Enzyme design. Structure first.
Site, PDB file in Angstrom:
ATOM      1  N   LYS A 156       0.800  -1.227   0.000  1.00  0.00           N
ATOM      2  CA  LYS A 156       0.000   0.000   0.000  1.00  0.00           C
ATOM      3  C   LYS A 156       0.827   1.270   0.000  1.00  0.00           C
ATOM      4  CE  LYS A 156      -2.511  -1.248   3.476  1.00  0.00           C
ATOM      5  NZ  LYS A 156      -3.473  -1.425   4.588  1.00  0.00           N
ATOM      6  N   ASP A 192      -6.683  -5.759   9.934  1.00  0.00           N
ATOM      7  CA  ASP A 192      -7.984  -5.062   9.816  1.00  0.00           C
ATOM      8  C   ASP A 192      -9.166  -5.968   9.479  1.00  0.00           C
ATOM      9  OD1 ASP A 192      -7.137  -3.062   6.810  1.00  0.00           O
ATOM     10  OD2 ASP A 192      -6.491  -5.067   7.315  1.00  0.00           O
TER      11      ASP A 192
END
Ligand code: 926
Ligand code: GLC
Length: 447
Positions: A156, A192
């Site tokens: 990311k 997450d």
């Protein structure tokens, strides 16, 4: 229709999805086996969050959340429902990562985090407390235990040197201890997906999957312990972090990848990695549109041939623009104001063209995603003995939440791909902070 031939290059037939779904199921099986876990594209990392061991302590927990551009800190109050536990954010702060906290060493970054953690406790008249810490850290990790695991490698965009290969919970305490100010029981570290899945589970016991479609894209599910070869034991069930974003890393997707995909890859901070995610994730969606828009301008088919100074710079067409353009009511005001901001003066048909490019990119993102979800679910179904399997998926992410049509296209496709499954989608309310905390409340009745 010279345009509509360029954009058709995004279409995926149902047959294409089935192929992708079956390949996902395939790489998922490979990741879970001893013989092939090492070169598996889909790591299927065990998370050590286990099938209800039942031992929860009420009280207030601190929760971190690193993984976005906006690092978060919050406090949450875990209690005891008829269900299991209740939870609730009570106070919360967000902090930008600088950039000198990126480029440099990991310690810098964790000191910055440590600063913020303290900064939070200052401004909350609580610096004099010792709380259990939940840590949502949204990068791939090899877990030795629920509170120890190494960073396989940043995704990311994050580039902090010396973080790869190390105990993330280590580097944290390392920096918490270079403070003295406070004391934290770093009880639990979660991805997450899992955080979200846990908080959804407490809302709905059927929740056995957790999914994130935001800056990145990933999923986690409840596996049968006897299939998690990388963990000793055969009784019970452990949640497993697929890390499907790296599906396609061993070439599984080459027949589908477009030029826009190849160009997004090369220019990215992680070339050759996270290929599937780069079809879905909101770190990439707008960049794909930018790239699509540009081909159209060189083919002299849009913007009357010419192109803006800005349109021509990486990361100018923000993902939120894809989103806005698709919410335009038809009057084109919305499409115009984005383009004008960019330094363009589109016409009626330019606007329509930019609209079509957007829908092509996000529709594909949605379909491609649905195949992975369908992969996970259908795999799980092979372990469920009942005519109609009712499963619940917990979901978070800006792309999933905020984009005008992803959710809808996404659901319909998933359902087409999952016969004999009754699927429920539930969106996680604060589910990250609550998730890390609720996982802590259990692993705390241990440390
Ligand atoms: C999500 N789901 C659905 C069925 N079983 C599960 S897994 C689950 C449910 C509730 C709590 C935990 C949990 C948290 C921390 C350590 C651990 O072993 N388990 C794990
Ligand atoms: O933030 C959502 C997801 O995006 C990225 O793909 C990460 O590799 C991953 O660990 C995570 O769960």
């Amino acid at each position: 229709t010279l345009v509509e031939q360029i954009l058709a290059e995004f279409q995926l037939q149902e047959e294409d999805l089935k192929k992708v779904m079956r390949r996902m199921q395939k790489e998922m099986d490979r990741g879970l086996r001893l013989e092939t876990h090492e070169e598996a594209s889909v790591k299927m990392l065990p998370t050590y969050v286990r099938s209800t061991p039942e031992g929860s302590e009420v009280g207030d927990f601190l929760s971190l959340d690193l993984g976005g551009t906006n690092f978060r800190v919050m406090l949450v109050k875990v209690g005891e429902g008829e269900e299991g536990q209740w939870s609730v954010k009570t106070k919360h702060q967000m902090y930008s990562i600088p950039e000198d906290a990126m480029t440099g060493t990991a310690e810098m970054l964790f000191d910055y985090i440590s600063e913020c953690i303290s900064d939070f406790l200052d401004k909350h008249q609580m610096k004099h407390k010792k709380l259990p810490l939940g840590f949502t850290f949204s990068f791939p990790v090899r877990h030795e235990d629920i509170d120890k695991g190494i960073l396989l490698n940043w995704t990311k965009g994050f580039k902090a040197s010396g973080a790869e290969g190390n105990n993330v919970v280590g580097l944290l305490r390392d920096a918490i201890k270079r403070r003295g100010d406070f004391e934290m029981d770093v009880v639990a570290m979660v991805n997450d997906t899992v955080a979200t899945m846990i908080s959804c589970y407490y809302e709905d016991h059927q929740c056995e999957v957790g999914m994130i479609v935001g800056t990145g894209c990933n999923a986690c599910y409840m596996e049968e312990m006897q299939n998690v070869e990388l963990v000793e034991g055969d009784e019970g069930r452990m949640c497993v972090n697929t890390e499907w974003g790296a599906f396609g890393d061993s070439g599984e997707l080459d027949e589908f990848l477009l030029e826009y995909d190849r160009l997004v890859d090369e220019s990215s901070a992680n070339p050759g990695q996270q290929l599937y995610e780069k079809l879905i994730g909101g770190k990439y969606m707008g960049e794909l549109v930018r790239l699509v828009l540009l081909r159209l301008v060189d083919e002299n088919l849009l913007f009357h041939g010419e192109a803006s100074e800005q349109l021509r710079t990486r990361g100018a067409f923000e993902t939120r623009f894809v989103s806005q353009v698709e919410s335009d009511t038809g009057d084109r005001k919305q499409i115009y104001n984005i383009l004008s901001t960019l330094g363009l003066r589109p016409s009626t048909t330019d606007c329509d063209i930019v609209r079509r490019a957007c829908e092509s990119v996000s529709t594909r993102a949605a379909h491609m995603c649905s195949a992975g979800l369908a992969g996970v679910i259908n795999r799980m179904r092979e372990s469920r003995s009942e005519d109609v399997m009712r499963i619940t998926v917990g979901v978070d992410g800006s792309v999933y939440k905020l984009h005008p049509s992803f959710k809808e296209r996404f659901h319909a496709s998933v359902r087409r791909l999952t016969p004999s499954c009754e699927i429920t989608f539930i969106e996680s309310e604060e589910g990250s902070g609550r998730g890390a905390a609720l996982v802590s409340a259990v692993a705390c009745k241990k440390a």
